[PDB]
Write a protein that binds this DNA or RNA. Structure first.
Ligand SMILES: [Zn+2]
Ligand SMILES: [Zn+2]
Lengths: 94, 99, 82, 108, 76, 148, 87, 99, 83, 109, 93
DNA sequence: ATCGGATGTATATATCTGACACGTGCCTGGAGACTAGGGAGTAATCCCCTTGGCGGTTAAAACGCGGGGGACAGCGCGTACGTGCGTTTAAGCGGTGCTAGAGCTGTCTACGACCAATTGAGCGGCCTCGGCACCGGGATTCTCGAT
DNA sequence: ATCGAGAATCCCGGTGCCGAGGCCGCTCAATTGGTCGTAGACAGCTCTAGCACCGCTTAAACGCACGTACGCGCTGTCCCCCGCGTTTTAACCGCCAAGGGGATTACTCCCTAGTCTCCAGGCACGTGTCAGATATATACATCCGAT
């Protein structure tokens, strides 16, 4: 058998089931969603790495990702994304 | 006596049909042959995956659709309905593709 | 050897593309300019894809290479990988 | 949160956290990666995916279909404002274009 | 003998075993006196992980020894 | 504050209507701390088993879920030896609409039948799945050891 | 709607109090502004009763400043003024 | 009897003179005050290095020069020497700045 | 220390001079109100990015480095001011 | 080579090679850095700088000045066909613009 | 104080090598520093991505060569490739 | 078709000043020698799939023709902008006072890198049934020549 | 202003098909537990320059009057895409056959990260001086009403 190939299929399907319980999704939409997730991940991580290199630091804390999300996304989406990330961080640590 | 539509009243119907559809608009074999010749110009004896040709066709279609939208807007700005090549050169010059 | 395949893009095909664009009346000189600009775009993208294939020590192009070649130029493409 | 349970469940997310952490470390973005960054990044990704999926599902239901196809994604992305600005450059395969006819071209 | 085992909960348990007693008998005594499932225990003597192959005589446990218990368990 | 008033309405609600086999009361002076009892349902392997559990309320309620802990020891695939409870409603779908009566009745319902899909303890869950009689007898000896 | 509102229905489903600056969700559920303004950051960003995401509607209405309903606020304050004044 | 130039020659002379020079064309203090007003909205009690203000002024001048070049091209395309706000709007829309 | 009605500081002769550099021979009278709006929007974007950059670094004074970085991010790369 | 002189002079260059190697290693671009890459990068950088400098010097000499100011750099970059495409998005500070006027706007005969 | 390194001496050496009787002002010097940094960052980023694409963990010379071929236009790319190949060949022996 | 103001721009010469080119102390980063282990080059082998080909068949492309609508040239107008000049305004430049805050340094504590055992989340291969596509029929709706 | 006939489009029902969601088996990567060198958080000190103020210029800005050229609307003419019909062409689908090269595993070797030690190359600092900006005074290209 061929080697494993990682993908974000399961998680996208789970989120879709959480939003619209009775709605399915096709394979081409899965490819599009996987590409979109990879694109956003690379953009955010690259911006965070660049910004951490600007201030002469070696670690990428949550603050760098927060600022990268504040920069890349439009303001209205940035506010909600920052709120969601702050939730996730404050709920994970306790 | 035979029924004939007014000049230009079926172009609107064609627009309304095509902007609703999502299929490809260029025949597969001619575009594939064009891609093959352009490729073999750079290097001899290449082999193309089908998905690669499909991606190339999708990119070309999207680019041409955008260019035609901007050209139509230029033509309407010039107080015209037709589109002429100078509109295409103006759109390319402003977009910075040629400069 | 293959040649004169640029005529494969027929006038009705460019007419349909322009109709999707949103034009109502097309002059008779659009077709040659459209062929020229399409050829230029294909030359650029295919050259980038062929260079990407060359770097990988392979003698066949892959849709993945074309996707990255499009991404480099600033025209990202979804639905084919990446 | 309690220990000895999966991190994705500890943080309440759906997207994986360990996978995001591994990608951050081994993707050559920095010498060291914090422990809290993957949670934040996965949360942002999940929020964006949920938003776009909800819009696509609403469009598909409006189109009287039960499965989301790329045309629904194109409609959801372009109809919205912030999502359109974020995804202005990307091209959706087999997505089509929005119906737009200039008022001048319409018959009088 | 008398062996004191300190767990992560601070529970004091004293076991009476023999140097010639095998690990199976010790685990049976643990099951009898505690009821905790056997698969959840891998014990540490002087920083060395215990293996059921060797007996207590090989280790030569000194009198009044403190025993530490750690092992991964899914569910917390 | 608002959490205190909400607790007041909820204590009045539980006082006016007592759930079957369920009683809740504040053991400490602080209103956040609570104690409750669970009685083994008739249609369950547990018979004549009564257990005591403690409830801790966060600073903000019901925005954050309460924490439930089992002071007594129960042998169950979904309950650890320490007494922690792994429940979906407790963390995944906690909502301000849900109340303490509902979460306790849900705990009782899960106590009726283990869920192998999300095993808190893997070995106990699998040995439960393999054979009914083994789990039945181990649960019986454990409940006569602890519950009675 | 419901020009003759009962006092019992005016109770907020969360904090059990008369509605203050009500906000109507697309699921036709009404609750006081503090409850929603809190649950949007410290709850699952979904309707507590319906359990479905409302992120898009909230995102669109936040920029337009159309969260509040003037008609329901006015009818509540005129019908039950003494509960509003004590707040 | 007084000598005055035909309308248009002075404009050409100014164009020729200004395309040769390289200094800045917006007064320093008004631009500094405008930058401070814009900045104080996002965060209060900020302080600016002089080099930052100069960089902002340079970038703004270059961007406006490019926009005016494109606007003039649009105006000349429609057989008009004069430029109009519709030309600016068309240039910005085709460049994708407004979308 | 409030600031008001200051966008008008970009005078009509300044915009005329900028257009003259651009290559404009005849300017209408409605240009001078559109140009101020365009400049305000562009400056708003650049200043927002620069203020975010100086907010991350826990500093109370912006620097030419932050402005250069914001311009590079927005696509308008700038030379001769550091980097 | 003789493996005796400094690394920069060993490759017959002027740009440093040790600095390029350090920047490649500590600039978190990859886990490992090859031995020959920094020499190639330094050569490319030197050659590009050489072209820009010679074009600026020519543009300054045609102006009858002995110093290269940013205006000369702008003229050299904009006039050359390939360098303009390479540096299309770059904004040179105090560089000005190339002088041109559309043929329509010239005075009528 | 602190030390702020730059590409100053090397650029001045190249300028003297090309035009023996000219000079460069400070502003043009900073412009040259910024340009060199920009080109270096572009090439390094492209080479890093190329190395990551093929499941490789090193940056050999051919990665830099391919990045140079991709980024620069035709004649510039050919001349840069020739110059780099000559430099590395003279370096390796 | 130029003619002579009238203007602005180009050109020749003294001068003096502040930035540019260069000398110098030195210290931090670059160079030289040895080790080891993991990454990368090389060889052998599988089988996926991409190229090549023949036959049907038929939707799409090519050619021709009538003509209505649109692009383009010419004319007239009145109004908005270019040009010039007197007047009010605030940028510009020098000099000074100061302190908020950038920037460097010494400690050390808590966050993150590293490594082995382990098993459960997640991927590959199968399978079936329902949602979607195709076709036949009719109801609904723009459209245009003639009133 | 409209009627009505011809043509395109939208609904509804029936039938068939194939891929999407669920399931089972398995291999590998995330968890956990503990250990240890170090990253940066914090407190403290130094001294740079960003802010605010003052006063004296005179350069750019402002408002007004006048004239003109050009943006806009209107009208007329010709010609060229459009819509339709008829005919020729090759795209498309199905089918078969082959072997080239992508992809995988196993093996070996050597390139480079790491460590330590030693030393000179570039950096901050200071100094001399001449290139170019400034002022002043001629000489020539260019524009404008009118012969
Ligand atoms: Zn409430
Ligand atoms: Zn709801």
């Amino acid at each position: 058998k061929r080697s494993r190939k990682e993908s974000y299929s399961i998680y996208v399907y789970k989120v879709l089931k959480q939003v619209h319980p009775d709605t399915g999704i096709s394979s081409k939409a899965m490819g599009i969603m996987n590409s979109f997730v990879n694109d956003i991940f690379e953009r955010i991580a690259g911006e965070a790495s660049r910004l951490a290199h600007y201030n002469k630091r070696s670690t990428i804390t949550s603050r760098e990702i927060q600022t990268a999300v504040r920069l890349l996304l439009p303001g209205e989406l940035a506010k909600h994304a920052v709120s969601e990330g702050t939730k996730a961080v404050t709920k994970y640590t306790s | 006596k035979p029924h004939r539509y007014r000049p230009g009243t079926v172009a609107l119907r064609e627009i309304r049909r095509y902007q609703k559809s999502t299929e490809l608009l260029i025949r597969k074999l001619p575009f594939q042959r064009l891609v093959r010749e352009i490729a073999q110009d750079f290097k001899t004896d290449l082999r193309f995956q089908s998905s690669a040709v499909m991606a190339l066709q999708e990119a070309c279609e999207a680019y041409l659709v955008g260019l035609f939208e901007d050209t139509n807007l230029c033509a309407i700005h010039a107080k015209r309905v037709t589109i002429m090549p100078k509109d295409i050169q103006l759109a390319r010059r402003i977009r910075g593709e040629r400069a | 050897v293959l040649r004169d395949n640029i005529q494969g893009i027929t006038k009705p095909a460019i007419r349909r593309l322009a109709r999707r664009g949103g034009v109502k009346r097309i002059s008779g000189l659009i077709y040659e300019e459209t062929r020229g600009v399409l050829k230029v775009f294909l030359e650029n993208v295919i050259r980038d894809a062929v260079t990407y294939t060359e770097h990988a020590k392979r003698k066949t192009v892959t849709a993945m290479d074309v996707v990255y070649a499009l991404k480099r130029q600033g025209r990202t493409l979804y639905g084919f990988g990446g | 949160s309690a220990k000895a349970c999966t991190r994705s469940s500890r943080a309440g997310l759906q997207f994986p956290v360990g996978r995001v952490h591994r990608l951050l470390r081994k993707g050559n973005y920095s010498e060291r990666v914090g422990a809290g960054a993957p949670v934040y990044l996965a949360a942002v990704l999940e929020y964006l995916t949920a938003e776009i999926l909800e819009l696509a599902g609403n469009a598909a239901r409006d189109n009287k279909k039960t499965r989301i196809i790329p045309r629904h994604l194109q409609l959801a992305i372009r109809n919205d404002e912030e999502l359109n600005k974020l995804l202005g450059r990307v091209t959706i395969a087999q997505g089509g274009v929005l119906p737009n006819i200039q008022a001048v071209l319409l018959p009088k | 003998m008398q062996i004191f085992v300190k767990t992560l909960t601070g529970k004091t348990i004293t076991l009476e075993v023999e140097p010639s007693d095998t690990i199976e008998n010790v685990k049976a005594k643990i099951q009898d006196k505690e009821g905790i499932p056997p698969d959840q225990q891998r014990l540490i003597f002087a920083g060395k992980q215990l293996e059921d192959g060797r007996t207590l005589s090989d280790y030569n446990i000194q009198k009044e020894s403190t025993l530490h218990l750690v092992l991964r368990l899914r569910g917390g | 504050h608002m959490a205190l008033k909400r607790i007041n309405k909820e204590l009045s609600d539980l006082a006016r209507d007592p759930p079957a086999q369920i009683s809740a009361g504040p053991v400490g002076d602080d209103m956040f701390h609570w104690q409750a009892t669970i009685m083994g349902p008739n249609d369950s392997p547990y018979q004549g088993g009564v257990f005591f559990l403690t409830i801790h309320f966060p600073t903000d309620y019901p925005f954050k879920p309460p924490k439930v802990a089992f002071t007594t020891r129960i042998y169950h695939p979904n309950i650890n030896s320490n007494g922690s409870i792994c429940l979906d409603i407790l963390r995944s779908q906690w909502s301000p609409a849900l109340t303490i009566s509902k979460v306790l009745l849900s705990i009782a319902s899960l106590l009726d039948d283990p869920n192998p899909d999300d095993p808190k303890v893997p070995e106990i869950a699998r040995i439960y799945k393999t054979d009914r009689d083994k789990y039945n007898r181990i649960s019986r000896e454990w409940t006569q050891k602890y519950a009675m | 709607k419901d020009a003759i509102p009962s006092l019992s229905e005016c109770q907020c489903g969360i904090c059990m109090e008369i509605l203050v600056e009500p906000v109507t969700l697309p699921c036709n559920h009404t609750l006081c502004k503090p409850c929603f303004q809190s649950t949007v950051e410290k709850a699952s960003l979904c309707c507590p009763f319906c359990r479905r995401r409302v992120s898009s509607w909230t995102r669109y209405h936040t920029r337009r400043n159309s969260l509040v309903n003037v008609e329901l606020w006015t009818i509540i304050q005129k019908h039950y003024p003494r509960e509003c004044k004590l707040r």
